[PDB]
Nucleic acid binder design. Structure first.
Ligand SMILES: Nc1nc2c(ncn2[C@@H]2O[C@H](COP(=O)(O)OP(=O)(O)OP(=O)(O)O)[C@@H](O)[C@H]2O)c(=O)[nH]1
Ligand SMILES: [Mg+2]
Ligand SMILES: [Mg+2]
Lengths: 99, 204, 131, 145, 249, 96, 242, 136, 256
RNA sequence: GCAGUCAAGCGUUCAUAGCGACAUUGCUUUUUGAUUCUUCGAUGUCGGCUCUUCCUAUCAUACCGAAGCAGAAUUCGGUAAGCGUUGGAUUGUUCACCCACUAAUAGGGAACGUGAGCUGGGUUUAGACCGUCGUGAGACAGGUUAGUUUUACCCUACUGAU
RNA sequence: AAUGGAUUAACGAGAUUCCCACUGUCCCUAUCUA
């Protein structure tokens, strides 16, 4: 062809960085991921995978995910409490701060 | 897909478990359902069932054997009331079929009285022959004898019993001396109002 | 609701508004774009002779001479003197984001103010030299 | 001719009687009706102060809007807050039956959680919730000092 | 279109196809008129049934001539499997018979509406309706033999495998009873019988596999005996154009 | 002729005759039947309708596109004082 | 590389956000799309159901990396509080107000170097370099104005849309310091940023993604532990046919 | 809903009936669109098929490039200027009518979208939301 | 009905003249009609007439009658009354057929806007027929008499129902009333091909034009016909050009 | 349709004095899907806005049946009228035919439903022109334009009210 | 072809077609006064 292969060459010819710095930049893999097992589909001992936590109490349109009970507070005793979000006038999220 | 696949699926899996029970219990019941459809099916479903049931008894018994009326003038003439105020009952239109001739060239509308329309002009006619039993589609050349008046001879009304002069060029018949015959006389046998065909028996 | 106010203030027939027009004068780059638009077929003065204060195209260069010498165009000059009334002025009136409000008023007094007045001075320097 | 707010052709030539289904003019309204599947949100108490305060608001206010309801006074009794719109008008007697059959949809099973109840005045384009807000926002007035 | 032919609905035999269309114009159209009516209503009643039945035969015929894969200019491979298997002469003659049979229905419908406008009574307009339906039934009863052929080539053309000649294939050719079916069963997912007799596969069987992130298809052959090299069995002739046309190893 | 454009009927034939009622208190036509194992429980109640108001609500509904979102909606408020009992009535089933 | 489909849509980057240290998914209907991330990522990093302005399209309203996270103006205070409770205290969260709200279509980034929309303001060009800690460059990919949709990145490598010129890749690879390939995803869809999500060790794309299309994505993003991107030259014979 | 539109579509006010000229929001080259019919519409005597925000309509082009004029093509409406109801307690409306044009699969023809895109339209159609520079 | 009146006047007449446009007779005339005349009515004569010949120059209209003389006699004619061309000639031509028939109906067949009902007005030399530059004039034919022998009949104009022959030259012939085009601006590059550079610049006289989308606005700013708001009306200027193409206010002609 | 052919039956008893179902052959413009661009005198007035009801000979939706029915789709066929059958483009026009949507754009009746509901668009006076015929008054093969029928308070019916 | 024909500026409570502007004619009805 020799008129169409330069279109295909736009995919094949990779790019090169030309290395343009002093600063070194490295990828980041957190070591909890490296230490983690690989999920196996059929296994006597595997993790629950909340697909399956969903199915055992109702189907897909009737199970109710608590968006809470999965987040990090300094005390888990108040993980279910309620932000007031309004007092008399002038809603709360404009007033709260550190100190 | 991927050539014939059901008959391979018959071999390697079987039809069903009760496929030989259900099929055998079909024609055990079909002796009772033929008498059931003939007593039901009210209104034209009992007509076409009886036409196909009677066509089966004929087809099975063959295997055992193996081993001019008068035409009024109030019809074929239409009162054409012309003008703005529809009171001019003068003009007439032929409502039956007509051979018009080869070179015709219509007269003016102010001058004419009798109207031969465009759609009812059969030029060619089915010419059946009693000897050799062959129907040939031949053109008409002239209208010699018309019954019920000598007046419709000049007009050309082609109802029934009208003797027309039909050419014979494709047949190529041989005469005495053998010059060749190119024309005959044929008599029409059906009203062309009922169908656009004009059937004419060539007189032998 | 009424008869006259519906004719001019529908959603279809809305003008630009006072908020954006103060932004167009405030810098020297957007002034030179609007004074030098590329000519367009779907615009009344064929994309020339555009007033920046009144968001309005004029038919002819004669129709800028008679438009600037009028009480209609001396509204919009007097209208655009001060702080352009954003949303932030209305929130500061209820006791809400003063420091967001007062810092913008601090910048219009210091920086954005005399940059605008040195642009409106050059428009009268230019529209008198060409007309 | 003869008007435009009407049915034009009221009948054909047979039968020679206006039939019972051709929409003539007459009484509108003041019929009895039955509307089913209305869902209770809130059952407050008369002795309970701060009925209108939910778990979010925490502002001690009653469900009575400012200056009361329109053509109806104050609430100070038990009440039922049921969604949608009950047939009838204000200061009229309604009767509340219960459900006639076991309902099947998931909409009959939801545990509602109110987040805010409006109490701005219905006698105008009301903006304020409590009469302490209106004095907070306006500032003091001439008849005050 | 290309690569597959499954989208042809049906065709009935002439005893059934005449039974459908004439039943269709009895149920749809109105059916009751009286002799005391105006002549314009009686004439325009039978004008409706001639044209509506006339379109009824054509809309079935337009479902035949559009569906069948138009054997000239498909591809010289798909033309030439159908040459050996379906016999191009009988294929092209029968479809051209229906195209002749379609145009004659248009001629009879356009005449017997045009002749019917001068019927001066009920006893004349009825006869033009019956002669318009009869001369259409003559075309159908005459077409009884080409319809039964086209039904059986419709049931076989859906079950042909889907191949593309421009795609990369590979042909597996050799003698009968060698192992070329058993080779195909282990190389790819396909239901091809492995019975130990000579001519098991009578048609081209295709299976798909993947090498180096691509799509390959493996076309099986029936296996051949060359003996006179000019004339050969139609089962065996399917191999030769699979070798000639298909541009792959 | 045959009406040339089919269209639905204007108005519902079920709620006829459209006429003024017999009393301002609408009568109850039928009650939930009887489950004769349950405790004693009243089946209806009567109160006075008074006005409307708005309600926001965090919609906890599985499957919807407004799952875990907020929804404004309008409710009625029916004034409901306590209601005092003064009588008992018994009914004998006849074949009428 | 994993094929996964939101309810029946192959578009993944519209509906999900994936960084090195956290993942963000929508709340649509059932938790089949949610568990398909936990099959690959697991307990290690927080995968958070959230909405942005009550919408499902959260992969195009936010933009962030393993340091910081940016949410637009229309994000309610509840959806802003809900994100902070879920994520640990390393990741910065800041509501950004701008003219334009689609932060996903506008800010394409890795942990190190980000590109922005050209008409973006100078005030947030400060804010992106502060929160994300990255170098900001004002650039178009072959003259397309939305850099978040037609260009995907990670610290490993990046993928651009196939209308990009040969000259424009090498000019732009000097800025990002990563290898780049004009690629297609989900059978020739040019929108490569919304088509897939990717971090430095995982890629999730649609079911419409074909087997040659996984070959480039696995290679240019260096996903396995024995793929140094040099084997994309050994995959040339696949790409000649495609 | 129909093809391409993921999810369901709630009831909003019908702003654009048949024969309503609206602006064109992409860089394809059309200036105004001209609606001829609305897909997913009802059927009632004497009504007009009315469009809304986030619908697909068949629309012609009156002003634009001569390659684009005189052919019907689908289009998705992104701005309305008739006040509708978000389900949190606010009504809102835009300045003008606008629509982008697309294939029946729902995939965009242009590369960018000028002006703000509606929120209900951006949820229903993913390929619009990839090309939307501004949401709401 | 437009074919029902055609098959009435073909059957009636003896000599059918056929008017052909001198601008372009080969795209004008008919295709199914002349083939029909030899097969079912062979005894009829079917002569051609080239009218509107003052619109075309001298040597070109003399070249059209010579090329067509090999099949039909093909008179050359101009259709007006106060200054005619060929008035005594076609009168003398009809004295030759009626002498062979020693009444004779003569119908005027033709293509629309080619001048059937203006040639009767110069044969009768009075205002018999309705003439107007819009195409759709008559619904019915009318008997028009002279010599006591020759009867003039004017059918309405006939468009052969071919798909091509063109999609867009149907506007370039006087067939469609050009008020009813949905988009007339696309046909403006069509009339640049027909009309030369000098002929279009001898009438509007402005300047040199390129890129016909520009040429319309060159005219629309000079005519001063513009929408409210300073906007050049692309429709109302393109309509006037496509009329002046058909009415003959611009000189265009296909070369022989 | 005509002209044959074949023959279970019919003809006072009856093959062959003579009829003839069920089948079938005669061509009815060319055996290789090329096209046929052919609309051939509807002599006559209803059509449409609003609105209701009724048949089934069912176009959709409910449930079955049968076919090379792998699925997907799609056809034939039955029971069924509960419910639903549209928006536009050219002539007074129905007649005749497209464009798009739709699950589907099914067929009919009720004085060819419906003028003391509307419409006067068209149907039918007197004014006027052009064309044909007539010496003429005038009529038309015909075309164009202009143009008065206007209750209800009566008994019944129906929707509401004592 | 003074049974008068072709042409044409200006003028017209004359006959017909379209384009901008515009709007409850219409989608689809609501409300106020005498
Ligand atoms: N300059 C010039 N104009 C002509 C000539 N002949 C005809 N025309 C113009 O062309 C227009 C159309 O002529 P018509 O008599 O209406 O032709 P038609 O459409 O067949 O007429 P009908 O038969 O009644 O339908 C006339 O109005 C004349 O103005 C000519 O010879 N020269
Ligand atoms: Mg073997
Ligand atoms: Mg003309």
């Amino acid at each position: 062809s020799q008129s169409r292969i330069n279109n295909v060459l736009n995919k094949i010819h990779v790019a090169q960085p030309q290395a343009r710095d002093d600063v070194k930049r490295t990828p980041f893999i957190p070591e909890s991921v490296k230490n983690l097992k690989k999920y196996d589909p059929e296994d006597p001992n595997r993790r629950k995978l909340a697909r399956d936590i969903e199915a055992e109490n109702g189907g897909a349109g009737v199970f109710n995910v608590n968006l809470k009970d999965k987040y990090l507070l300094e005390d888990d005793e108040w993980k279910n409490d309620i932000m007031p979000e309004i007092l008399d006038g002038k809603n709360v999220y404009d007033f709260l701060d550190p100190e | 897909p991927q050539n014939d696949y059901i008959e391979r699926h018959i071999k390697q899996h079987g039809k069903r478990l009760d496929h030989e029970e259900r099929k055998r219990k079909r024609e055990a019941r079909e002796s009772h359902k033929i008498s059931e459809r003939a007593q039901k099916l009210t209104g034209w479903k009992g007509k076409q069932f009886a036409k196909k049931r009677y066509a089966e008894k004929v087809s099975m018994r063959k295997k055992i054997k193996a081993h001019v009326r008068g035409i009024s003038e109030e019809e074929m003439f239409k009162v054409i009331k012309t003008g703005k105020s529809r009171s001019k009952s003068w003009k007439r239109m032929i409502t039956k079929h007509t051979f018009v001739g080869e070179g015709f060239t219509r007269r003016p509308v102010k001058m004419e009285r009798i109207i031969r329309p465009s759609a009812l002009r059969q030029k060619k006619a089915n010419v059946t022959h009693p000897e050799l039993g062959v129907t040939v589609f031949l053109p008409i050349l002239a209208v010699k004898k018309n019954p019920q008046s000598p007046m419709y001879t000049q007009l050309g009304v082609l109802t029934k019993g009208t003797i027309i002069e039909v050419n014979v060029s494709e047949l190529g018949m041989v005469t005495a001396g053998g010059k060749v015959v190119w024309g005959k006389y044929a008599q029409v046998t059906n009203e062309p109002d009922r169908d656009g065909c004009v059937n004419a028996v060539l007189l032998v | 609701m009424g008869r006259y106010s519906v004719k001019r203030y529908k959603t279809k027939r809305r003008t630009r508004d006072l908020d954006l027009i103060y932004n167009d004068l405030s810098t020297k780059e957007s002034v030179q774009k609007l004074l030098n638009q590329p000519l367009d077929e779907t615009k009344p003065g064929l994309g020339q002779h555009y007033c920046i204060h009144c968001a309005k195209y004029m038919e002819t260069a004669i129709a800028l001479k008679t438009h600037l010498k009028g009480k209609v165009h001396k509204r919009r000059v007097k209208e655009l003197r001060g702080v352009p009334y954003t949303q932030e002025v209305s929130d500061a009136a209820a006791g809400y984001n003063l420091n967001k409000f007062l810092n913008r008023v601090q910048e219009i007094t210091q920086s954005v103010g005399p940059e605008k007045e040195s642009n409106e001075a050059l428009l009268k320097e230019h529209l008198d030299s060409t007309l | 001719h003869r008007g435009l707010r009407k049915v034009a052709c009221i009948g054909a030539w047979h039968p020679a009687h206006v039939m019972w289904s051709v929409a003539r003019a007459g009484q509108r309204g003041y019929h009895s009706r039955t509307s089913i599947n209305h869902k209770i949100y809130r059952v407050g108490k008369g002795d309970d102060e701060a009925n209108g305060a939910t778990s979010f608001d925490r502002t001690k206010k009653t469900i009575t809007p400012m200056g009361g309801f329109v053509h109806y006074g104050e609430i100070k009794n038990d009440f039922i807050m049921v969604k949608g719109c009950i047939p009838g008008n204000r200061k009229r007697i309604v009767t509340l039956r219960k459900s006639l059959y076991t309902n099947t949809s998931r909409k009959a099973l939801e545990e509602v959680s109110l987040k805010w109840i409006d109490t701005a005045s219905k006698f105008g384009k009301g903006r304020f919730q409590t009469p302490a807000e209106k004095h907070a926002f306006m500032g003091t007035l001439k008849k005050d000092l | 279109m290309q690569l597959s032919w499954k989208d042809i609905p049906t065709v009935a035999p002439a005893n059934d196809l005449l039974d459908i269309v004439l039943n269709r114009t009895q149920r749809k159209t109105p059916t009751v008129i009286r002799p005391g009516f105006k002549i314009t209503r009686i004439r325009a009643f039978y004008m409706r049934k001639v044209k509506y039945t006339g379109e009824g035969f054509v809309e079935k015929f337009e479902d035949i001539l559009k569906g069948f894969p138009n054997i000239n200019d498909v591809h010289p491979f798909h033309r030439d499997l159908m040459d050996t298997l379906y016999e191009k002469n009988h294929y092209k003659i029968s479809l051209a018979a229906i195209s002749r049979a379609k145009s004659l229905v248009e001629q009879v419908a356009r005449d017997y509406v045009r002749l019917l406008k001068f019927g001066q009574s009920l006893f004349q307009c009825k006869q033009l309706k019956r002669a318009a339906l009869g001369r259409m039934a003559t075309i159908v009863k005459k077409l009884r033999d080409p319809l039964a052929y086209l039904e059986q080539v419709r049931q076989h053309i859906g079950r042909l495998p889907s191949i593309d000649p421009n795609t990369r294939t590979l042909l597996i050719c050799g003698y009968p009873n060698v192992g070329k079916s058993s080779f195909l069963r282990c190389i790819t997912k396909s239901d091809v019988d492995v019975q130990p007799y000579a001519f098991t596969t009578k048609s081209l069987y295709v299976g798909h596999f993947d090498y180096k992130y691509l799509r390959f298809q493996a076309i099986d052959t029936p296996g051949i005996l060359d003996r006179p090299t000019e004339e050969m069995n139609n089962i065996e002739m399917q191999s030769i154009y699979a070798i000639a046309h298909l541009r792959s190893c | 002729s045959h009406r040339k454009y089919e269209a639905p009927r204007h108005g519902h034939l079920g709620f006829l005759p459209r006429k003024r009622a017999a009393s301002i208190r609408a009568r109850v036509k039928a009650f939930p039947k009887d489950d004769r194992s349950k405790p004693v429980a009243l089946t209806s109640f009567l109160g006075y309708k008074a006005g409307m108001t708005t309600i926001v609500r965090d919609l906890d509904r599985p499957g919807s596109k407004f799952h875990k979102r907020e929804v404004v909606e309008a409710v009625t408020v029916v004034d409901t004082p306590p209601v005092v009992v003064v009588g008992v009535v018994g009914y004998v089933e006849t074949p009428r | 590389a994993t094929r996964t489909q939101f309810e029946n849509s192959n578009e993944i980057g519209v509906f999900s956000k994936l960084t090195n240290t956290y993942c963000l998914v929508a709340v649509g209907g059932s938790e089949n799309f949610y568990s398909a991330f936990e099959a690959e990522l697991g307990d290690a990093i927080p995968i958070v159901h959230t909405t942005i302005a009550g919408t499902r399209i959260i992969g195009r309203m936010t933009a962030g990396n393993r340091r910081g996270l940016l949410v637009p103006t229309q994000t309610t205070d509840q959806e802003l509080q809900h994100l902070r409770n879920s994520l640990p205290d390393s990741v910065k969260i800041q509501r950004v107000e701008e003219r334009l709200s689609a932060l996903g279509n506008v800010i394409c980034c890795n942990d190190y170097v980000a590109l922005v929309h050209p008409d973006i303001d100078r005030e947030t060009e400060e804010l992106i370099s502060d929160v994300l800690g990255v170098e900001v460059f004002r650039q178009t990919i072959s003259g397309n104005i939305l850099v978040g949709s037609y260009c995907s990145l990670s610290n490993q490598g990046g993928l651009v849309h196939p209308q990009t010129s040969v000259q424009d890749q090498e000019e732009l690879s000097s800025l990002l310091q990563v290898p780049l390939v004009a690629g297609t995803v989900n059978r020739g869809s040019s929108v490569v940023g919304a088509g897939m999500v990717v971090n430095d060790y995982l890629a999730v794309t649609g079911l419409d993604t074909t087997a040659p299309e996984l070959s480039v994505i696995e290679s240019i993003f260096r996903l396995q532990d024995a793929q140094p991107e040099s084997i994309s030259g050994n995959l040339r014979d696949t790409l000649i046919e495609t | 809903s129909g093809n391409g539109a993921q999810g369901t579509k709630f009831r909003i006010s019908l702003g654009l009936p048949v024969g309503a000229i609206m602006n064109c929001a992409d860089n394809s080259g059309a200036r105004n669109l001209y609606i001829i019919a609305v897909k997913g519409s009802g059927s009632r005597l004497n009504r007009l098929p009315a469009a809304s925000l986030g619908d697909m309509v068949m629309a012609t082009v009156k002003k634009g490039k001569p390659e684009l004029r005189k052919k019907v093509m689908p289009a998705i409406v992104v701005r309305q200027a008739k006040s509708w109801r978000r389900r949190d307690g606010v009504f809102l409306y835009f300045e003008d009518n606008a629509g982008v044009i697309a294939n029946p699969k729902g995939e965009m023809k242009g590369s960018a979208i000028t002006g703000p895109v509606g929120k209900e339209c951006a949820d229903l159609w993913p390929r619009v939301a990839s090309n939307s520079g501004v949401v709401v | 009905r437009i074919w029902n009146e055609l098959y009435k006047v073909i059957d009636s007449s003896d000599v059918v003249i056929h008017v052909l446009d001198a601008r372009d007779p080969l795209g004008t005339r008919c295709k199914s009609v002349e083939e029909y005349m030899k097969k079912e009515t062979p005894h009829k004569h079917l002569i051609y007439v080239l009218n509107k010949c003052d619109l075309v120059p001298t040597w070109v209209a003399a070249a059209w009658v010579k090329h067509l003389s090999k099949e039909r006699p093909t008179l050359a004619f101009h259709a007006s009354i106060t200054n005619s061309f060929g008035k005594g000639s076609l009168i003398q031509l009809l004295r030759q057929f009626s002498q062979l028939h020693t009444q004779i109906s003569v119908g005027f067949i033709g293509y629309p806007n080619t001048g059937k009902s203006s040639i009767i007005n110069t044969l009768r030399k009075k205002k018999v027929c309705q003439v107007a530059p819009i195409p759709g004039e008559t619904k019915v034919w009318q008997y028009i008499t002279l010599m006591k022998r020759i009867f003039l009949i004017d059918c309405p104009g006939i468009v052969p129902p071919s798909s091509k022959d063109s999609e867009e030259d149907i506007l370039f012939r006087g067939v469609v009333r050009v008020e009813h085009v949905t988009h007339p601006e696309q046909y403006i590059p069509g009339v640049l091909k027909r009309c030369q550079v000098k002929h279009l610049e001898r009438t509007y006289e402005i300047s040199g034009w390129k890129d016909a989308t520009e040429f319309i606005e060159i005219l629309a700013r000079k005519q001063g016909r513009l929408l409210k708001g300073g906007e050049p009306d692309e429709s109302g200027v393109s309509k006037q050009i496509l009329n002046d193409f058909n009415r003959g206010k611009i000189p265009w002609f296909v070369l022989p």
